[PDB]
Design a protein around this nucleic acid. Structure first.
Ligand SMILES: [Mg+2]
Ligand SMILES: [Mg+2]
Ligand SMILES: [Mg+2]
Ligand SMILES: [Mg+2]
Ligand SMILES: [Mg+2]
Ligand SMILES: [Mg+2]
Ligand SMILES: [Mg+2]
Ligand SMILES: [Mg+2]
Ligand SMILES: [Mg+2]
Ligand SMILES: [Mg+2]
Ligand SMILES: [Mg+2]
Ligand SMILES: [Mg+2]
Ligand SMILES: [Mg+2]
Ligand SMILES: [Mg+2]
Ligand SMILES: [Mg+2]
Ligand SMILES: [Mg+2]
Ligand SMILES: [Mg+2]
Ligand SMILES: [Mg+2]
Ligand SMILES: [Mg+2]
Ligand SMILES: [Mg+2]
Ligand SMILES: [Mg+2]
Ligand SMILES: [Mg+2]
Ligand SMILES: [Mg+2]
Ligand SMILES: [Mg+2]
Ligand SMILES: [Mg+2]
Ligand SMILES: [Mg+2]
Ligand SMILES: [Mg+2]
Ligand SMILES: [Mg+2]
Ligand SMILES: [Mg+2]
Ligand SMILES: [Mg+2]
Ligand SMILES: [Mg+2]
Ligand SMILES: [Mg+2]
Ligand SMILES: [Mg+2]
Ligand SMILES: [Mg+2]
Ligand SMILES: [Mg+2]
Ligand SMILES: [Mg+2]
Ligand SMILES: [Mg+2]
Ligand SMILES: [Mg+2]
Ligand SMILES: [Mg+2]
Ligand SMILES: [Mg+2]
Lengths: 149, 77
RNA sequence: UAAGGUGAUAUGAACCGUUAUAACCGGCGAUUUCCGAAUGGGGAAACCCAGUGUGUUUCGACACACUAUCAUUAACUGAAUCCAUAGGUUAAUGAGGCGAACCGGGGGAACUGAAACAUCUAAGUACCCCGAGGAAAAGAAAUCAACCGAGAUUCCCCCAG
RNA sequence: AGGGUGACAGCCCCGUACACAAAAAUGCACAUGCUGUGAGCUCGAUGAGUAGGGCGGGACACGUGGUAUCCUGUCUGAAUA
RNA sequence: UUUUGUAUAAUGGGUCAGCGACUUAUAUUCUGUAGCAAGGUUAACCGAAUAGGGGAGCCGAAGGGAAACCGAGUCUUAACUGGGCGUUAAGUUGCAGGGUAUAGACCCGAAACCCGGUGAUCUAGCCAUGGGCAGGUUGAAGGUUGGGUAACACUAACUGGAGGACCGAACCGACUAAUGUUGAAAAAUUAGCGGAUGACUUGUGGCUGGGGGUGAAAGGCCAAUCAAACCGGGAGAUAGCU
RNA sequence: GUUUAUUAAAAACACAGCACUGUGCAAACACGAAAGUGGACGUAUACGGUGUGACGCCUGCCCGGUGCCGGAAGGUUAAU
RNA sequence: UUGAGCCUUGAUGUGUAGGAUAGGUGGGAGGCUUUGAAGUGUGGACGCCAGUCUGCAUGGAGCCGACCUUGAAAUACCACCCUUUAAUGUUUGAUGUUCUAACGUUGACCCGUAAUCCGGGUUGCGGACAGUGUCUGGUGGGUAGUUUGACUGGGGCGGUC
RNA sequence: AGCUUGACUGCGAGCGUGACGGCGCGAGCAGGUGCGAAAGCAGGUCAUAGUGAUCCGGUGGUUCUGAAUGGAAGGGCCAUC
């Protein structure tokens, strides 16, 4: 019996995969317990329509996420109103909200969850390195300035 | 009776033929099994008296389609 | 339609009628006990016994009506089990049984013939079963033909023992 | 035509040829109202556990034969003008 | 009637009267007869209905060869000096008849085989619920007392009331004989006989159904003939026999 | 005790007793295409089938044939 | 677990001139190293006991190329490979062990339900077995249909055709 | 004893014997052959037993047939089992 898998299933395939299987396995287990469906042509077209529409959403999201990655390197330097203590140490700190809100209202609509700092929250006056995740795998960098209020 | 609720297959008659071509009347019975089908749309199992052939019809069409045939036929399940 | 009538054995009795409710003929109505599908339950057919509702110048039991099963539909209900579903009650509508042959279908003999007998025959006959109609069944080519063509089905005559 | 009448009846009786007739119910027909059914047009669509096949039977005048065609109890199983 | 042969002491008929057995349909061939004649004739159907229409067909005027094929010839064989079958006889359609074919096929007659029903009011076995066994005997186990024994054993009397126990009516059966045998009776009657508290007997109702039942088993019984009941049907089975 | 109702009542059938043998319970077995049922509301000291036939003293030899029970290596061997 | 195919990727060569158990064919001047070598201390496997691959530890600044021989080159390194061998990945079986989910339940329970049927549900026990359908070999007087000759000094036996 | 394959192929006037199916005898004709100088002889064996119809099927051959047509299968014919 050709069937198309719903949830991922051991030794067969992942969601969407097409596989041949013994009828009794499909009939008495995989189908009732919602793990697969027959390989009717309407159904395989359903999923081919699905694979391609999903492929388009992944190509275009990548077209949107790349666009913002060109824009991150486009600004390439940012200022933040930062009350800097004596010697150089910030009375406060510059978080992802602080960085995010600078660049959103300065061009690129970056949410704070996208901002990625290593150790620091930035407690010093100076110019800093900040990288970002805008897609699962496309990343870019701005540089951050700290002007003493 | 020995009747498939899906295909209508039922006993048919015919001959045993010997080597010397003696005909004796016989029957050919369908290959029937009572089987419990999970019907999703009714959160329930339906037990059908089905020939194995009838099982393959249900794999092909889906139990929902085949039960719909049972209704239209007036047959209850 | 009528001058005669009240069926027969079958008289008699008591009566009806003659110009139009005598009788007789035909159409349409009324009444139509009990048994019988028999259908409120039962049963050894023509009988035994109920429930509910109605009626009593007497509101007793007696009388009258309804109450079988199955199917489709609807309303009200309603488990195991949360919803649901089964189930349950009621109502509307239908069916049931009978009966000639022909008709479609599910099953299907044997004697017999073969000069014995088993393949074969008898014969898809006899019979049993289911269902329908005035007819039934069949029916508008995935049919034939034979390089020309025909143009659904059914029946008759040939082809041909 | 036939029957009846005290024996064998065209003309005695009932009939027969021919000509007629329904208050009422009903058949069938054209017409018409009605509730319902949908007409012609364009662009489509074109019947899968099916056809085919293996095994066992059955049906075809055809007894498995070199045996096409049909049905299918059992196991399988296409192409898409 | 049947036989080589029947007065035959072989068959059949008591007699009379009435009935009782070679038919019918369709094919086929021959004879007779009639029509037309190298032609004869139509079938279903149409119909103006025993007419007329209808020539679809059928038989015949051509055979030979397995066939292709050739054709008054052909086949046989490489080919026949030849040989086989043919060429030189008129047919066809009615009508009457003789035969044959298929049909019950001249009439009557089996023992039986198959199918669907009806029967356990007789009888077999079982199930439920009821009834019956006069009278007379025998006297098991157990128990008590006595004797006895160290104690048991044992032993006597008594008590007790077992048993497909004994004798014997009812009741159940059926060993012998006579009678009867067109009976009083399609199984009995008389005199005798066996069982008679039991694996007994019996009433009412129930269940088992025909290749089936039931059978303490005889192929017994299953409604007066059971090695396959009865009724209806296949059915006019078949009958080289009488 | 039973039996050929209707020519046989017997030495025949049955019988208690004996043996063989099947049967673990949804038993074997039997009536039933099946469902259901008897066996049995029993359970191996039970139930079925077969033979023998109270009791006493006993029941020897033969497994080649036929029947049955057990066997897995080898040969042969079905559909497929 | 295992037989028959696959794929990475690792084992393995005594023509003689020799730094000496020369693998053919190519890229071919630097690889290999602290993600830690040369060296010696020992474990294992192969074996022509000449040596080869190789785990562990110790060690700590090298084993290296035309440097010449050799038909063919450096154990600096790299790619398809063969002589053969092992083991991870795969198709089909073979066999087994478990599982649960088809299916069985003539265990207990719940509801339908004042029910020793049935159905649904819960649970326990089994479980791809059992059982059934189609096909197939064997068995099969349990049942069935039949056959089982004629001649003959009757028939049968014998003989005969 | 020498040489040899007439234990030939196609036919057959005319006969015998049979209810029939059949069985037998046969000179001569054509082709081709052996033996003989030649005339000639040879279509098995001195003769008379030594055998099995039909159906179905097998093998080889074939100017036959060949279900639309070309083939093929199957059939026919000849030989044989
Ligand atoms: Mg009533
Ligand atoms: Mg009552
Ligand atoms: Mg009633
Ligand atoms: Mg609820
Ligand atoms: Mg009716
Ligand atoms: Mg016969
Ligand atoms: Mg009617
Ligand atoms: Mg019709
Ligand atoms: Mg055309
Ligand atoms: Mg007179
Ligand atoms: Mg179509
Ligand atoms: Mg077809
Ligand atoms: Mg053949
Ligand atoms: Mg005599
Ligand atoms: Mg005389
Ligand atoms: Mg006499
Ligand atoms: Mg006499
Ligand atoms: Mg007379
Ligand atoms: Mg003639
Ligand atoms: Mg006594
Ligand atoms: Mg007496
Ligand atoms: Mg006595
Ligand atoms: Mg009685
Ligand atoms: Mg008959
Ligand atoms: Mg007769
Ligand atoms: Mg007697
Ligand atoms: Mg006697
Ligand atoms: Mg004995
Ligand atoms: Mg002995
Ligand atoms: Mg054995
Ligand atoms: Mg199995
Ligand atoms: Mg078989
Ligand atoms: Mg046998
Ligand atoms: Mg027999
Ligand atoms: Mg017979
Ligand atoms: Mg004789
Ligand atoms: Mg010479
Ligand atoms: Mg052949
Ligand atoms: Mg063809
Ligand atoms: Mg052709």
């Amino acid at each position: 019996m050709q069937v198309i898998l719903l949830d991922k299933v051991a030794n067969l395939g992942s969601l969407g995969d097409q596989v041949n299987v013994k009828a009794g396995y499909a009939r008495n287990f995989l189908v009732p317990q919602g793990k697969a469906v027959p390989a009717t042509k309407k159904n395989i077209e359903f999923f081919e329509a699905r694979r391609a529409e999903l492929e388009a959403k992944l190509a275009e999201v990548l077209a949107a996420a790349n666009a913002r990655a060109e824009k991150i390197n486009a600004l390439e330097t940012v200022t933040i109103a930062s009350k800097a203590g004596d010697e150089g140490k910030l009375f406060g700190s510059i978080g992802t909200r602080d960085i995010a809100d600078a660049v959103t209202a300065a061009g690129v609509e970056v949410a704070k969850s996208e901002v990625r700092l290593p150790n620091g929250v930035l407690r010093t006056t100076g110019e800093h390195e900040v990288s970002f995740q805008v897609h699962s795998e496309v990343f870019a960098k701005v540089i951050v300035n700290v002007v003493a209020e | 009776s020995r009747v498939c609720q899906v295909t209508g297959k039922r006993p048919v008659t015919g001959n045993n033929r010997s080597h010397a071509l003696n005909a004796t009347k016989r029957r050919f019975l369908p290959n029937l099994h009572s089987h419990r089908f999970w019907v999703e749309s009714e959160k329930r199992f339906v037990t059908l008296r089905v020939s194995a052939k009838g099982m393959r019809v249900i794999d092909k069409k889906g139990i929902d389609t085949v039960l719909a045939e049972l209704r239209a036929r007036g047959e209850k399940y």
